[model samples]
Target chain A: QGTVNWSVEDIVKGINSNNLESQLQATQAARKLLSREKQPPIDNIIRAGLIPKFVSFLGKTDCSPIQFESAWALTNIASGTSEQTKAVVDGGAIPAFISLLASPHAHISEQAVWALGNIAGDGSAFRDLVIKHGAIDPLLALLAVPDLSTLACGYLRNLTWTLSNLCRNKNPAPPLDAVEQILPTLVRLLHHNDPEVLADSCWAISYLTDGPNERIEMVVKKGVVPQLVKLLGATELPIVTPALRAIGNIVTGTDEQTQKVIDAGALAVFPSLLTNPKTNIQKEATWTMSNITAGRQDQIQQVVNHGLVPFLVGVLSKADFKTQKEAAWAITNYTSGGTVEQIVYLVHCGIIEPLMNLLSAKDTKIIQVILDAISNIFQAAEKLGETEKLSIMIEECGGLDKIEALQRHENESVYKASLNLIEKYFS
Target chain B: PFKKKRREA
Candidate 1:
């Protein structure tokens, strides 16, 4: 017999037979059958049309192995596509996954992690269940396994990656306390001997370090930079991207750390990443470059003199609107209060029109940054007695006449403040 | 009164 087309009754009978090898073989065969070109039979099996038969296998200690294998089979079938995946997720598979994670059998627990990872690959699919079912606690508890097996480590790593991605969805940044609680465990794993474990640990840490300067500083204090730098040089793409991001986060706000990163040859490594074919790599390289020059006028000038400005302007021409916007903000933030001649150079580089466009952006933050940049140029020119530069700045940003009219308005306190400041400047 | 008038002006 090539393969027995076992009825649901026969499969249930085999599950009750206490023959481990037979049951595993039958379950594996069922898995293979589900992937056939014809899907109706598999779909019905998944619909659990034979619910009474399946329910008999549950809650029986003598039949736990069968139940685990059956659940594993269902999980594999459920994860084939979005519709099936959503069905299992809605059919209370999360609780089963959580229970299997606590199973005494290592193989069963590993399968559970794999099943959960596949089901939760799309963050919206099972993020709430994963979080509410307290899956992280058990997965993290596996780390305490002295002499963890390769299989165990792989399971934990996949589980944590899924959790990290879930936490990263732009929806109201995950509560800071949740991040704080898990960060120490991730930091501990950085010293793991297995490269895979170390890579996932870095990824989890990178995700946690993404928001706010304070969170980045917390990550830096954990002493992750040296480890991340080492991982960056390693020949692993998974490790390299997050390591670069971690470097960007740490050095973005701290001058000493920025110099340290540059001294550690990050400047050399970063430009190479710009040549990388991966769009993510290129985007991240630009982001890192922007962070490196932020609020550091000397570094900005150095970068500009090193031919970075032309490349940046070229990138501005080729990049999408978001990238161009970031590039503009980076230039504006870096070049603020620079010399009148520097402003002239930027304008001559075809930057004025884009800068004006950014000033009219509906986003208040972008508009504020652009206006501040224009103001800085005007102030610098005024200080150097460069009337031509001053006139250009004023005319482009709506002239003194507009300013005076705005200042005279009854509701224009901010404009009046600006006028008073200008009067003080002239005085 | 003189100070107030000066402020308003």
Candidate 2:
């Protein structure tokens, strides 16, 4: 008369034992487990070496409760973890992921997107596979439905993240033009109350804009920057970083376009970011500022006269080496030859040593800035040709090491300026 | 007669 009840352990043991009744019990247990929170270890077991059995269960002939349980179990396992998702993918999971897209059960379809996102997050390796398997159409279809559930948002987020990862430059894959076909729907998602949806839409826009100059211009024409600025102003940090990066990439393309972005509220957005606590946001903001003012000397002088330099210098000092290096690069780009007093201020503030060290920082942005600043100072010094002035420039700026590197790079303008300075020094 | 001629006209 002890508790005459079957427990979960009994059911699991039955499944392991392979008895017919045990299989029946396991099917019921699996269905219950599907409705529960996913556990990664269980997902790993299904995806690990036992893939064939899992697949066979999913394909079971009986359209009974057990079949439904098996389908749900596969969905749960595939959607659980990146490693398990990858295992399913390696075991040829694309067709199954796509099939689940058309599943009668909403949960199964949602899990399909989750699994695809995790698998494709591996990058372009699975891009063609998913595309060829008709994954895009169902995902796009999901975007069209009104009153989307939280489950829908989860699926959309994964899909967008996957697209963004695949589209980044390391792959050299062509732009997913099919993405443009879905932009209107994605833009509509920007109006959704879910901040996460808005964030993912921003990320997708950023990726789509990563194409050639004309394509990027088309993105600007689509009025993405204003929405992004609104999102940033709303203090959505998760979205703001990628939004800033997208804006930075776009603005870096042309002077006219850069001004347009600033006119579109980037100026207001970027300066306020100087007070941001997040280091990544600060870095992105500085990078965007650098891009916006790349060739505009007047804007550089304007920023400096507005007391932006001291803040920039402060940020540079507090930043880690990479951030300091990037901040210096941005400053140097903005404050080249025309801004002599600003350069002098930077020198007096002990910025020159860090700038010189950045020459060997090997970060591309930092190296370019060092080259520019050296060229600017050397040229100005040679033109003035006063012993007192020359010595001040040299002592403050790591004079010979910087000059030699510039000359060695055969950066003609920098080399010429350095040669002039050396001649004046000898004279 | 004049009346008759007028009627004919």
Candidate 3:
């Protein structure tokens, strides 16, 4: 398939030739050949050692269009392996691209940002290089502009992603200087309509706020949970994925922060995002649902009022393995952590039937949650004899027979839990 | 007798 038989020697010669026409033609060939829907083996081109010559034409004052094609070629070439991107980085493209972020021409900035985004996407060491070269401040300056060209909007997408990756490099984590200016701008851009911009902005937030509860606290202090929650309705998988991630990480913070996210009406939207056609959205949304149910009893009721039980029962039967398991985990917390009345409310929502049926699950921990949920259902009784109704249903479903099977489990706690539930209720 | 019952049925 390596059909492009142009002499690499001649092309390099054209790039360096005294005549402008020769230099431009050589650069244009590099772009055109790489531009095909399926590239013709660029590894051969990289190994030919001509990438540095392409990078040399960037920032040439004598020939601006040549510089554009040079940047374009670098962007395409850098789209290859880390070795290819590292060639761009080693050619000293990182700072050049960073400085070019301020180019008055929108297309120039767009192509340059793409080049740097690829560079930053490589090894974490390379990411640190982009930051070390002062990429952040200039990109943040561009983001601060009120109105930008269509090309600049495209530039912002990769620029945001590049900065996000730079922030992600943590041998000893990146400082606030990288994240601080960027986060506020990203939060402002949450309502940005372009899918790429919205997606990248959300990813930037997720990366920034990702670690210890302390990072979560700063994130909460930034007051972004509400904005993150609002983006959860994004139907686009790209936007929804990072949107859920950002909110998911934030909800893992202090209960007060979680409560604030709840107050932002996350509960109303989570059920829809949970059952989304996208499995990624399904799995993440399920995990976040579990966390939301982990909050205060009143906060848990916020989920209930937003219809948690119906969704749980719906997901339990039809959702995938991880999603089903996470929904069970959420339901387990739902039953354990709530008041009797709350449990009673779920009891009537047809949740009991699924729990008893899911008793057939082979996973030890999932089995444990299912058994615990049954115990909680019994405990939620208004009277001690109130479990008679539940016991009757359990008996009809042969739940007693199933737990008897689990009583033989290898894990002692699961064995004891199944044994205990059998004795306490049925006997 | 059982054969007669089957036949009768």
Candidate 4:
């Protein structure tokens, strides 16, 4: 709230004072300046070389206020550029912050969570550094405490943000057992009423389940599907985005795991999402559809049974290229994994026209999969002794000409797929 | 943050 801007010298001098009260007041001033409503001098503070001093204050357990102020200042510092975050870490702030998580003061504990979250969010190596110091268990323990007060809920939000950061962005993911320790708490948080808490819980779960089927199995065993599917229908886009992401990861699991998602009534929520105004929602929803459609025929049928085929065909034709690519994937994946009856159903829904339109798509994978899908549709028709009828549909939809043009595609896979489709279905 | 690995079909 102070109008006067303090030089780094004045700020650093006050923080370095011998008197305890003076030290606390100066650190609080530094914290306030950094927390300014407008842009704070983050780099100035870092350049002043005051990080080590503030970090040192975190170790002063006898003065809880100073410890809190220092943690707050360090938290804001870490919230700056990656190099700024690196300065805090390089100043030996992590262990001090970790120590404060066990501080008897609740604000100090929450500030520690805030600081750790910033450090974790900077990138994977720093995140793993925090995790390496064993931040997860203590953070979960704070969250495990059952307090319904408004203040407690605020603390829960910071904890959830921190936990979500810990669970993300890994070239080498955090240790499996460390992440496994997080699953049950995430499941419990999913049922919480707070939207931010629910969103972060879903994001954390999404990161955990995004790996191998074994990881997905671990998450599924915690029984999160029902709430996850419930959140997919949430009115807020923030809540729905991560919830769908978590659900999408689960769908990418083994067929049994995918069925569990289908059984949770996720498909019913999906048809509505197809027409959502946001492109991200449409893109991810279609991405999720692609995974489910890649599952066994019963799962693919569950997708079709939800009456998503016509809507999906519409997306393929009308949505942006990203959404359309995912729609194409869903359709092509259906063609690859679907029953003949389902493939016939999709064709009748006019999936051929969009597939034909996407033939000149820029992505080779899209072209390859489209070719695969068109090949499967012809095969499905052949199985029903109706190849001529389906060929007429493709020809009329301009797919026959698109396939003919694709023989000149630069990608060998696109060319080979196009050539194969032409020989088997057309020639 | 998104996961690093892509789930191959």
All candidates' chain B TM-scores are 0.16, 0.16, 0.14, 0.47
User: Model 2 chain A — which ten-residue stretch has the worst lDDT?
Assistant: A1-10
- Give me the candidate number with maximum lDDT: 4
Pairing residues by index, what is the TM-score of model 4? 0.92
- What is the docking quality class of candidate 2? incorrect
TM-score (C-alpha, index-matched) for candidate 3 = 0.85
Itemize residue pairs with steric clashes in candidate 4: none
- What value does DockQ give for candidate 2? 0.00
Task: Give the TM-score ranking, best first.
Answer: 4, 3, 2, 1
Q: What is the C-alpha lDDT of each candidate?
A: 0.59, 0.59, 0.74, 0.83
Per-residue lDDT of A1-427 in model 2, one digit per residue for the tens?
A: 2212334455456556656555656655644544443332455345334444445554444434444455555555554445655666666667766666676666556655655655555455565567667777777776565665554556665555544443433254434475565666666766666776677667766766665677677667766677767776767788787677778778777766666666666666555676588888887777766665465766566555556666666667576565676687666675563556655665556655655655555455455566566556555555556446646656566655655555465455555655654555533
**Model 4: per-residue Cα lDDT over A107-170, one tens digit each:** 8998899898999888889989998898887887786556533447878888888888888875
Q: Can you give the lDDT of residue A421 in candidate 4? A: 78
lDDT of 2 at A242: 68
Q: Distance (Å) between predicted and true CA of A280, model 1? A: 2.9
Candidate 1, residue A168: the lDDT equals: 56
Which tens-of-lDDT digit does each residue in A1-427 have in candidate 3?
Answer: 3323455566667776888888788777666666653645467667767777776777675677877887887877777777777777777788778767877777887777667766766656877777789877877776666653343554666666666666564555666666676667766666667777777777777876677778777768878777777778656778778888888887787798788788888888876886788787888888888887877898888887887778877887688888888888888888888888888788787777777778788787898888888877887762546877888888887778888888888898788998888778777
Sort every candidate by lDDT, greatest first: 4, 3, 1, 2
Report how far residue A362 has shifted in candidate 2, in Å. Answer: 11
Worst 10 residues of 4 chain A by lDDT: A143-152
Candidate whose TM-score is highest: 4
Give per-residue CA lDDT, model 1, range A1-427, as digits (tens). 5334665445545544577666555654454454332442546565544333332333344656656655556555554666666666666667777777777777667666766665655444365457667776776676675554554555666555554544554344555665666676777677766776676677667766666777777777776677777776667787777787777766666776566666555665654565565667667767777776674666666666656666566555556556656676666766663555666666567665556544334454544455455566566666667756555555565544444443454444435544653563422
